[PDB]
Amino acid sequence: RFLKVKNWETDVVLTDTLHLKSTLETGCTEHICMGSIMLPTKDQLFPLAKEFLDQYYSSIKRFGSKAHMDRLEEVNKEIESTSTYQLKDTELIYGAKHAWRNASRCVGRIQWSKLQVFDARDCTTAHGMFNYICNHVKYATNKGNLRSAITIFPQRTDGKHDFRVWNSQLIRYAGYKQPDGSTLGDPANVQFTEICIQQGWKAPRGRFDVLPLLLQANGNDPELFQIPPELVLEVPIRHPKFDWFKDLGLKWYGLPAVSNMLLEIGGLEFSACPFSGWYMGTEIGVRDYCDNSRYNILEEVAKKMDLDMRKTSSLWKDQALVEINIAVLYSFQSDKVTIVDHHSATESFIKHMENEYRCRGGCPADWVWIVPPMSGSITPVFHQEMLNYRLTPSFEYQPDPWNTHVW
Amino acid sequence: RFLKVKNWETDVVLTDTLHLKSTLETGCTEHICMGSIMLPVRTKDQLFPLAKEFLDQYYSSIKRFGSKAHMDRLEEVNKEIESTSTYQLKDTELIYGAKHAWRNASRCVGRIQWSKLQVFDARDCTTAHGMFNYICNHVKYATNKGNLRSAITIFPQRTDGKHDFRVWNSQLIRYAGYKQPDGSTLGDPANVQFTEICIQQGWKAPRGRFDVLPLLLQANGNDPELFQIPPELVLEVPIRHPKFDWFKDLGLKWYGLPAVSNMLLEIGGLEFSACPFSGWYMGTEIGVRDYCDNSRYNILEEVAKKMDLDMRKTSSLWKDQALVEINIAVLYSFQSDKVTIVDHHSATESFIKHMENEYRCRGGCPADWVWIVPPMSGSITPVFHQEMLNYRLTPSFEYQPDPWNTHVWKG
Numbered sequence A: 001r002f003l004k005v006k007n008w009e010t011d012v013v014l015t016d017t018l019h020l021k022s023t024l025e026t027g028c029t030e031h032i033c034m035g036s037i038m039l040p041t042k043d044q045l046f047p048l049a050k051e052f053l054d055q056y057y058s059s060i061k062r063f064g065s066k067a068h069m070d071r072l073e074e075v076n077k078e079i080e081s082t083s084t085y086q087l088k089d090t091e092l093i094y095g096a097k098h099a100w101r102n103a104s105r106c107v108g109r110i111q112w113s114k115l116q117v118f119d120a121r122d123c124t125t126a127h128g129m130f131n132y133i134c135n136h137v138k139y140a141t142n143k144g145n146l147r148s149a150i151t152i153f154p155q156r157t158d159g160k161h162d163f164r165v166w167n168s169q170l171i172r173y174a175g176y177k178q179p180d181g182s183t184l185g186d187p188a189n190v191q192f193t194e195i196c197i198q199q200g201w202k203a204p205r206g207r208f209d210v211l212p213l214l215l216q217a218n219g220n221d222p223e224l225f226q227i228p229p230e231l232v233l234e235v236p237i238r239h240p241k242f243d244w245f246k247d248l249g250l251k252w253y254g255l256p257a258v259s260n261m262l263l264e265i266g267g268l269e270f271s272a273c274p275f276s277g278w279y280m281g282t283e284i285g286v287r288d289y290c291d292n293s294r295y296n297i298l299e300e301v302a303k304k305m306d307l308d309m310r311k312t313s314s315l316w317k318d319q320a321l322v323e324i325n326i327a328v329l330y331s332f333q334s335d336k337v338t339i340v341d342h343h344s345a346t347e348s349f350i351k352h353m354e355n356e357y358r359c360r361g362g363c364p365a366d367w368v369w370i371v372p373p374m375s376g377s378i379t380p381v382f383h384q385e386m387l388n389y390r391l392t393p394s395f396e397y398q399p400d401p402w403n404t405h406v407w
Numbered sequence B: 001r002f003l004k005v006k007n008w009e010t011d012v013v014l015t016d017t018l019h020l021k022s023t024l025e026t027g028c029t030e031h032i033c034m035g036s037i038m039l040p041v042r043t044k045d046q047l048f049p050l051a052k053e054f055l056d057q058y059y060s061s062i063k064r065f066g067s068k069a070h071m072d073r074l075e076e077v078n079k080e081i082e083s084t085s086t087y088q089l090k091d092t093e094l095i096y097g098a099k100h101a102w103r104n105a106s107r108c109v110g111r112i113q114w115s116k117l118q119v120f121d122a123r124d125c126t127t128a129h130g131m132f133n134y135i136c137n138h139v140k141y142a143t144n145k146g147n148l149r150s151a152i153t154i155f156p157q158r159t160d161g162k163h164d165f166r167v168w169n170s171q172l173i174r175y176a177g178y179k180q181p182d183g184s185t186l187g188d189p190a191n192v193q194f195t196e197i198c199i200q201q202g203w204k205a206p207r208g209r210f211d212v213l214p215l216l217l218q219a220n221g222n223d224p225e226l227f228q229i230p231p232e233l234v235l236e237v238p239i240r241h242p243k244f245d246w247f248k249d250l251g252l253k254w255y256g257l258p259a260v261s262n263m264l265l266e267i268g269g270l271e272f273s274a275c276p277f278s279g280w281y282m283g284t285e286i287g288v289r290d291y292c293d294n295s296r297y298n299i300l301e302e303v304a305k306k307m308d309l310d311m312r313k314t315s316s317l318w319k320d321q322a323l324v325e326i327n328i329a330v331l332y333s334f335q336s337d338k339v340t341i342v343d344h345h346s347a348t349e350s351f352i353k354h355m356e357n358e359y360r361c362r363g364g365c366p367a368d369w370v371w372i373v374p375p376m377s378g379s380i381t382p383v384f385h386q387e388m389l390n391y392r393l394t395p396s397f398e399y400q401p402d403p404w405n406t407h408v409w410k411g
């Protein structure tokens, strides 16, 4: 019932009670652990609204006040009559911040309470969404001094009128198959790149072509828009000691900004809610560059370093991997674009867990995602037991819209 | 119920039906996942079902299910339980058992090898001296002058829980740790406590950085006895680096035989509390964990110093750089002395092929991702991208409490 987590490097033991407030289900049972699976009405809504409002008013130390009981009645009335309800600004801000706070896969959560929330609930068209998105991108980029933010479009009503950003992130690079049969650019976005072309985009057909935005308002068909290049901050990737590294021709974008998730607050569903923070180096250098199914450049780099690629046991992949990641961090830091390394991020998160254990009674954490994709055991999160559970408000995945949409 | 796992790099999808034969519990529920928690005497009552399930599995594996020999064995075990309260395994069922425990070990990346296990039956053993003899033979056979062979030695099973056989060491070969008055540690910090127990039982400690510990062996619930493993039987490898000549001057070595001696083997409800087993090392066990854990030898700083890396900011990745070099060294050293070792790329690739084969022939392969993924360079190994289902089959290896917290001293 009251659960303990131990750090095996420091012997620090924390007691978890926040898990008892968990509501949603994990995928696991007493017979099977699903910890490494990537994705495991009016009557329905009031309990949801109540649970959310009760936590809001406790958070502002007004649990059981006239103000609390009055709001519970006001939303109860609004549901009974309208079948949905509207969040107050203050509740919206709190909800969004708490969706990040409860994101068990996110190592960056020490920052959860500095999140700039942009209320785009008055938006009605794709051109509108475009305008809101450009303002978000420019505000968050802050000329390389990056600031966290979320922009919240209108909530689902009857699911026939959804707002969606079809892009998986606001800024991503294009991918094209070839008659060759190999792949130019980013192979993860091949299908989305086709949908854009198939919608009308004129692809330059390069390695690092910033994709166009595809925005859907009110369940209408979505529309293309180019983000002004001047708003897309990019970093050329060089190495502090390998001169030839610059000649590989690599760059990445400064602003990580996920746009295909659904934000759930007090039972209400916000299907378009792009948010952004800043990169941990490994996301670009380990995953983007070195995944077999991504830019997959390890082979090409190890060659330039003249390492022995005859045997896996020379650890030539490993050697190359480190150098790529030293380069990513170096380039960003040199150009003054915020980035965090995996050592500093994981250390922060250990302190965040401490803070949340004492102030909140726990911190849901998914170990499989929190431990970085390189050098796991030399980061302190490797040795830290974590309990994973689902709290609300939350971010959730949702199906890619082209499987759902009705044209 | 059929359950799919997807490899996200290859798009290979596999279907698990084997999870249906799982009886024991995970620690998890529908509301909490305990997948990163390190650790989440029987009556006639609970024993014949466990026996029967074990023998239905054994008899299916040999294609004799429902034969007269299957039924007669069931009847014979039943009578022996209700007459004597326990029962004895046949040699063949013991071999099958020990192998399936390995095969079912969800945290083991080296399971491709499960069916090549040399089983030594030590169930006639009665004294600590007899245990020492058995363990020596295990170590010489397994070592095989550097061409390592997998093996397990099985001492008598638990009876009333008051006559247990235990190996007090956590591995058959492991180095001392000594806490100094100034708070520093000499040798391996992981073994301080155990080193302290040996001292007190009368071991005269050389007190160096790499002193092979003595065996502390308990037979028949008796007080443990100290033995020294003959040094000529302890194969060791000095660590050097193929390019950095100063690496040898760090003074490092390691032993070649990894041999876990503190787990409990369960087969058809029987509990073997002393069942030391051994394979060979994956390089990262020594290079990443044994040398570079902060709570272990912790040589990262000294290695980075000698490489004159930039140690003023973690963003130089000086730690990551030092770690790869140390691991290269470990692998070069073992290979140069012709001692079996496997790198993490080779081992994880093998495992993915094992896992696939197991889904085809067995209908599943339980696997613990937190443990299967190597502790360096995770995402450039294919296991990182592999979805896995973790569940508990029997026979199985299990943890047990350290014997010094439970033993009743005789004096």
Ligand code: HEM
Residues within 6 Å of the ligand: A099, A100, A103, A105, A106, A107, A108, A109, A111, A115, A148, A149, A150, A275, A276, A277, A278, A279, A280, A283, A340, A345, A369, A395
């Ligand atoms: C401020 C800097 C931030 C850092 C360094 C950071 C770091 C990370 C990292 C490394 C991951 C794993 C991503 C992957 O491997 O695909 C992650 C996942 C996640 N982060 Fe954060 N994050 C940050 C800000 C945010 C903010 C502002 C939000 C929300 C407001 C957020 C919500 C999430 C969610 C929902 C996931 C997992 C989504 C999924 O399950 O696919 N992150 N983050």
Ligand code: HEM
Residues within 6 Å of the ligand: B102, B105, B107, B108, B109, B110, B111, B113, B117, B150, B151, B152, B277, B278, B279, B280, B281, B282, B285, B342, B347, B371, B397
């Ligand atoms: C033949 C070469 C072998 C290799 C390379 C291999 C590799 C590994 C590695 C890397 C781990 C995780 C170790 C750690 O990080 O602490 C492991 C765990 C395990 N292995 Fe294997 N193994 C091998 C043979 C065996 C044998 C012969 C047995 C039993 C007969 C076995 C049973 C297990 C068990 C029970 C664990 C989990 C221990 C725990 O939960 O603490 N291994 N093995």
Ligand SMILES: Nc1ccc2ccc(CCNCCCc3cccc(F)c3)cc2n1
Residues within 6 Å of the ligand: A038, A039, A108, A256, A258, A276, A277, A278, A279, A280, A283
């Ligand atoms: N630096 C940051 C900041 C915020 C982030 C917020 C979210 C994310 C992760 C976005 N990942 C979604 C894609 C993961 C996925 C899941 C299932 C299947 C699949 F193909 C891909 C990364 C972040 N990085």
Ligand SMILES: Nc1ccc2ccc(CCNCCCc3cccc(F)c3)cc2n1
Residues within 6 Å of the ligand: A008, B038, B039, B110, B258, B260, B278, B279, B280, B281, B282, B285
């Ligand atoms: N190369 C091999 C072969 C067989 C192996 C068999 C088992 C093992 C792991 C042995 N570790 C036992 C203790 C793990 C543990 C659990 C809880 C707390 C703790 F500090 C350590 C490693 C192996 N390596």
Ligand SMILES: C[C@H](O)[C@H](O)[C@H]1CNc2nc(N)[nH]c(=O)c2N1
Residues within 6 Å of the ligand: A035, A036, A037, A038, A368, A369, A370, B008, B384, B385, B386, B387, B388
């Ligand atoms: C199969 C496994 O769940 C999958 O590869 C996961 C593992 N851990 C991860 N961890 C992070 N941070 N990001 C990811 O995409 C993944 N992918």
Ligand SMILES: C[C@H](O)[C@H](O)[C@H]1CNc2nc(N)[nH]c(=O)c2N1
Residues within 6 Å of the ligand: A008, A382, A383, A384, A385, A386, B035, B036, B037, B038, B370, B371, B372, B373
């Ligand atoms: C807390 C966490 O589960 C623990 O540190 C685990 C993580 N994964 C591991 N994986 C292996 N192979 N060996 C280990 O000791 C550990 N330690």
Ligand SMILES: [Zn+2]
Residues within 6 Å of the ligand: A028, A032, A033, A034, A035, B028, B032, B033, B034, B035
């Ligand atoms: Zn689980």
